[PDB]
Design a protein around this ligand. Sequence first.
Ligand SMILES: *[C@@H]1O[C@H](CO)[C@@H](O)[C@H](O)[C@H]1NC(C)=O
Ligand SMILES: *[C@@H]1O[C@H](CO)[C@@H](O)[C@H](O)[C@H]1NC(C)=O
Ligand SMILES: *[C@@H]1O[C@H](CO)[C@@H](O)[C@H](O)[C@H]1NC(C)=O
Length: 494
Amino acid sequence: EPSCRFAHQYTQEQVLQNPSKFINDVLFWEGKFHQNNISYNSGNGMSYDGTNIDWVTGEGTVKHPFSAASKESLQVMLYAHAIAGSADAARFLSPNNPSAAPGIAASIMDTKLQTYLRFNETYPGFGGFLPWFTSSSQDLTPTWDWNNRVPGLDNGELLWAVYAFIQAAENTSNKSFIDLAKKWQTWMDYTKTTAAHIFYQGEGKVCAVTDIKNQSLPVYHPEQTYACEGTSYLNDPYEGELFTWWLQFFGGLSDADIEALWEYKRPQLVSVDYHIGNVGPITVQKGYWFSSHETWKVLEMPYYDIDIIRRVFQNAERARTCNSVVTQVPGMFASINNVTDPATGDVVGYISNAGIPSIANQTIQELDVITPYSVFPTVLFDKGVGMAWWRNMAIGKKMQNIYGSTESTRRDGTGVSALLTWDSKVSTVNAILGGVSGLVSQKMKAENIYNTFVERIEAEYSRVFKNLKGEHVPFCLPQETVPDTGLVDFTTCN
Ligand SMILES: *[C@@H]1O[C@H](CO)[C@@H](O)[C@H](O)[C@H]1NC(C)=O
Ligand SMILES: *[C@@H]1O[C@H](CO)[C@@H](O)[C@H](O)[C@H]1NC(C)=O
Ligand SMILES: *[C@@H]1O[C@H](CO)[C@@H](O)[C@H](O)[C@H]1NC(C)=O
């Protein structure tokens, strides 16, 4: 029912007055991203990173034929909600027939698993993990750059997503769905047997990227070797922390090695105070860039069951929203694709370093490009405020399309990334659905690792964050709009 260009059909206050109505429109159009040759390959059930859309028409043109376990995790998390019978996930997957959404998720995940297993057979050296892959043909291949290279961070995200999906499928008591869950449990369980050998160097050091001698050789072939790429380790509180937990619970590490994981991580967990103009001080967890993307872990594991953690991450959103108000930015910041050059149709590059410099490890930042998915952590705390920010960016010229929100816009409104990706779109969807931490905590409790998670993560956070300021500072609403400088809405979405 909703118009493609629904964002400017609402006022800001109307979004706050009824977030659910607005979200219902959001989910409908976000759902249109979920099509063959747009966001995934229906032949092998594998994600594509996304696709370019035509500068003028806003229709799919040039797909990204590659993806990674990180995008897989967004797709899988959605399917976890869909198979559990979530009405919102159904709005996304199957709006004209909600009752079919579980079956669609089940079918694709069946097809997907087959593809994962063919990849494992052909490339056993990955030990059941996924590199960046080409998904445009029936069988997966590593992208050229990712031959014999496997990232811990991305796989950590996928593994907890699959963990959630398994629980969701089994919660249905549908024997078909339970059988599917058990096959996925086998896939997931295999990674437990290889994780430490592939990614754990020792003394609490976990490879960010592991270099494989030869991906064609089995994990324990007499010639096979694994080594960390350089001295980049998963040692910080951002997305890589999901993989830390994988090693801890399932990797077969000693108690001394588990202690070493958290000890080596401790110096990267830091309390800092945001304070600009009359906003703050607000005590936050120091970010890498304080890109929204860095908070991803809270959607996969029940971090927010711990009050000190919930309070620290709530503070993040006080800082994030109000920072944009005080610096007069009509959106918020996250790692994102740069604008499209209209003459070529090509994205001009990728902007990793977009966040909030004053509360970041990396202070050298590009802040000319804003993105709707920057709201996903705000959405977890306050759907209304999250969606108000989302709306403010989506009303920018060309920032809605027939597949939902557009990747990104310049904050001065002189350029747009004419692109769709899972990262810029379905991150937000998964935040709207409340993450999968609920499903995960159920399975964690059943497998008696929940109490360990809570004890450990409360200890680590409570040791650093002792004297919170700014907890009285309300979330801020957008005060500036994206300038209209002559860009024209897509002809299929105006
Ligand atoms: C992956 O391949 C290895 C080695 O051929 C095999 O032992 C393992 O069972 C496979 N993984 C799964 C989940 O079937
Ligand atoms: C990697 O192992 C495969 C499988 O035996 C072998 O055929 C291939 O030549 C190896 N690659 C290199 C560069 O040694
Ligand atoms: C993004 O594009 C702008 C021009 O629109 C350019 O000045 C900037 O350096 C680009 N950044 C990246 C990281 O590609």
